[PDB]
Amino acid sequence: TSAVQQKLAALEKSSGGRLGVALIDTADNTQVLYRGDERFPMCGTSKVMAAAAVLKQSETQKQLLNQPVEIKPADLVNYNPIAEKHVNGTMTLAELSAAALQYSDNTAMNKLIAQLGGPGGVTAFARAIGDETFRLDRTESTLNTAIPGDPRDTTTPRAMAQTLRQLTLGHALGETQRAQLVTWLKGNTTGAASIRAGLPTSWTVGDKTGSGDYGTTNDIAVIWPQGRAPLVLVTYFTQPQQNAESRRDVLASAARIIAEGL
Numbered sequence: 001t002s003a004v005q006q007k008l009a010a011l012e013k014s015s016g017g018r019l020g021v022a023l024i025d026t027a028d029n030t031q032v033l034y035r036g037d038e039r040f041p042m043c044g045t046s047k048v049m050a051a052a053a054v055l056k057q058s059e060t061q062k063q064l065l066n067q068p069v070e071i072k073p074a075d076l077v078n079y080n081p082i083a084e085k086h087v088n089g090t091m092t093l094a095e096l097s098a099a100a101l102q103y104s105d106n107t108a109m110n111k112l113i114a115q116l117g118g119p120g121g122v123t124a125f126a127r128a129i130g131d132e133t134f135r136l137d138r139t140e141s142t143l144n145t146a147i148p149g150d151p152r153d154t155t156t157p158r159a160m161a162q163t164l165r166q167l168t169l170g171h172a173l174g175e176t177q178r179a180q181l182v183t184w185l186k187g188n189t190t191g192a193a194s195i196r197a198g199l200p201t202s203w204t205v206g207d208k209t210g211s212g213d214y215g216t217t218n219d220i221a222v223i224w225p226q227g228r229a230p231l232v233l234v235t236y237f238t239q240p241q242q243n244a245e246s247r248r249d250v251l252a253s254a255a256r257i258i259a260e261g262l
């Protein structure tokens, strides 16, 4: 047990829940893991895989991101802040990707899933880039049920950190696609109280949050400090009570502990 792992264990004990953390330091390719091989419900953090899968399609279909997609009343689900603005109209796949990633729009996510041929098309892209752990089983909004022990719509912190590294810092995507994903993540609007809240305010962050039942509160992030190699940080948190409140503060505290031990 390292110093950082003892503090993360203390944070978890103080929280009442179950915490999963994976850090990759790309300077020396070292890793910090806390419950790094346990499964956690992804919730909206799975939207990165779906957006990346559509970006991968656009490497062959070069104008794909410009393709209009109808938004119909039947498409609306539980949380659709951007798509509701375009019902009975269209959004492009670029606009749907940005809405899914930067506003956590669940209707937008369902349009990405449909473009990929169902949840199996998202999982397929994960396997194609070497992620053997990720599984997407359902569409929105039921993929956020986050039931303890349910393997559906889960991954592990170790696997998600490696995948996020390959998609953003690595070259699992083409050059313009990789840059587009980074731009989208940097422009996220839902992460101010999560990993970002625990990091020095001068560091540049791109991130995607997730939330669900059982007070499931997640965030995955690529971090660019000034003057050193970037980091990839995954923080997953879930709780014993189905109706538990969100705990974004736990993710901020985990990020702060990781930034300390660095």
Ligand SMILES: C=C1CS[C@H]([C@@H](C=O)NC(=O)/C(=N/OC(C)(C)C(=O)O)c2csc(N)n2)N=C1C(=O)O
Pocket (backbone or CB within 6 Å): 043, 044, 045, 078, 079, 103, 104, 106, 141, 142, 143, 144, 145, 146, 190, 208, 209, 210, 211, 212, 213
């Ligand atoms: C803040 C949101 C808006 S909802 C959107 C999606 C996120 O992962 N979550 C849900 O749709 C969601 N589903 O749960 C229901 C209740 C639909 C379920 O699956 O039964 C949920 C629960 S608490 C919360 N906030 N969002 N996700 C998050 C996020 O952090 O990105």
